């Protein structure tokens, strides 16, 4: 059993898209508002997120079939999935030795107490770091990593999506490429696919905790004035 | 002829308010998004402005009688006058030797070509720098400087102000303290007061050029996403 030419064409599209939208140098982090260690870290992490949303948008525009959805559907998927793809792509900088995200230098290494200084409580961040270690232990290939993002993003069980059936089609067609890639190209991966779908379920639970805490934060203007226009728009509500 | 105890009480209030809302160290400028030398300078200057608006708000809350206006009137005066008080208070860092604003170090020295890289054309910036040199040549005392701000801000000829007569009262009562301070405490100032009112008229002409160019800029989301929530709100239109 072997992968069709079009599922490689897909795999190729998804990894080139990820490489275009992900800077392994983290050299744009100097252009954020600097970190400061209430809510000292909120400015710097608000730009970090806003920047990442711009990257997630560029990645989605390159998933096959995404461009051809209606702009309303594209917005609904992005608004609902944005924080999830961020939690996913962020694993690439996460590291088990420091149990933090180590980007660029040490001014850009965010342990759990940095994110608390951006206005978040441990019941978001413990399942978050555990998500990231559980997923770091799954030791995904680059191909499974970009697939899991593309899949999470093209999920039709989102609030507000219209052409439900078409997205479910495209999502499944990407799940087939994944499950097929693990069987052929990943030794020891006969339990992996189910472990990935379980990570998607954890992403949902995180999504909701984060959406709740951000709500509390965005309704206090001393703090929401620290956010960026883009963040406010994507995590906002008036759709 | 000599100044009443209440006009000193006013002068005292206005300079202590200015000293509370103005950092001569410019040491908070490191917390802005760094300058970069399209529109490279827009992020750093957008935070510069947003920060300054926070300072102008703290200053107005300390002008005598301002707290007692209705919150709608306070908003209307701030929204219409914000960019003017910024152009005024900014003279304190402006310098004739460099013909730029030299705050803190040299990363925070803004010549005219820096502000062009934040999306503004010379027909705003030449009358701006000329405003600043004409006003730098008037060599105001600290007392006349804070007065001219308090006066510019409490002007009732603003779009959207309600209790017109009360603001005109308070503005005039501050003009009397000014004109009286120059006669008593400023030698050579028998032409000064009229020169100050003429600077208020230049501030209006600047206000409109800036309001026009910002309009063009705020209607392009690649650029307005660089602004801050506060800037968007104060220079916006939905009042």
């Amino acid at each position: 059993h072997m992968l069709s030419d079009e599922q490689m064409q897909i795999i190729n599209s998804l990894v080139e898209a990820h490489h275009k939208t992900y800077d392994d140098s983290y050299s744009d982090f100097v252009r954020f508002r600097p970190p400061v260690r209430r809510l000292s870290m909120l400015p710097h992490l608000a730009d970090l997120v806003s920047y990442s949303i711009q990257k997630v948008i560029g990645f989605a525009k390159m998933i096959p079939g995404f461009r051809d959805l209606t702009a309303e559907d594209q917005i609904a998927l992005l608004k609902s999935s944005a924080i999830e793809i961020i939690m996913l792509r962020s694993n690439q900088s996460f590291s088990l030795e420091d149990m933090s995200w180590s980007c660029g230098g040490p001014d850009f290494k965010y342990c759990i107490n940095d994110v608390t200084k951006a206005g978040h409580t441990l019941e978001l961040l413990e399942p978050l770091v555990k998500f990231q270690v559980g997923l770091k232990k799954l030791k995904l290939h680059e191909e499974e990593h970009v697939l899991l993002m593309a899949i999470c993003l093209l999920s039709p069980d989102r609030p507000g999506v219209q052409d439900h059936v078409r997205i479910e089609a495209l999502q499944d067609r990407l799940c087939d490429v994944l499950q097929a890639y693990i069987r052929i190209q990943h030794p020891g991966g006969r339990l992996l696919y189910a472990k990935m779908i379980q990570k998607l379920a954890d992403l949902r639970s995180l999504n909701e905790e984060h959406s709740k805490q951000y709500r509390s934060l965005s309704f206090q203007p001393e703090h929401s004035m620290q956010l960026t226009p883009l963040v406010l728009e994507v995590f906002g509500s008036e759709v | 002829h000599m100044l009443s105890d209440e006009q000193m009480q006013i002068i005292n209030s206005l300079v202590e308010a200015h000293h509370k809302t103005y950092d001569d160290s410019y040491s908070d400028f490191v917390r802005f998004r760094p300058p970069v030398r399209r529109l490279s300078m827009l992020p750093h200057l957008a935070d510069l402005v947003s920060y300054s608006i926070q300072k102008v708000i703290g200053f107005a809350k300390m002008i005598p009688g301002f707290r007692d206006l209705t919150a709608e009137d306070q908003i209307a005066l701030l929204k219409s006058s914000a960019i003017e008080i910024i152009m005024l208070r900014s003279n304190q860092s402006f310098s004739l030797e460099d013909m730029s604003w030299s705050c803190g170090g040299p990363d925070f020295k803004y010549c005219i070509n820096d502000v062009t890289k934040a999306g503004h054309t010379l027909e705003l910036l030449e009358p701006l720098v000329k405003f600043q040199v004409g006003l730098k040549k008037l060599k105001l005392h600290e007392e006349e400087h804070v007065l001219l701000m308090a006066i510019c801000l409490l002007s009732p000829d603003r779009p959207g102000v309600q209790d017109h007569v009360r603001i005109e009262a308070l503005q005039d009562r501050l003009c009397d303290v000014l004109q009286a301070y120059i006669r008593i405490q400023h030698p050579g100032g028998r032409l000064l007061y009229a020169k100050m009112i003429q600077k208020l008229a230049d501030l209006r002409s600047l206000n409109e050029e800036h309001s026009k160019q910002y309009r063009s800029l705020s209607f392009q989301p690649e650029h307005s996403m660089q602004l801050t929530p506060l800037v968007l709100e104060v220079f916006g239109s939905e009042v």
Partner: peptide, 10 residues
């Protein structure tokens, strides 16, 4: 709304 979002998507 989604002025910025819609434009980033071209």
């Amino acid at each position: 709304r989604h002025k910025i979002l819609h434009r980033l998507l071209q």
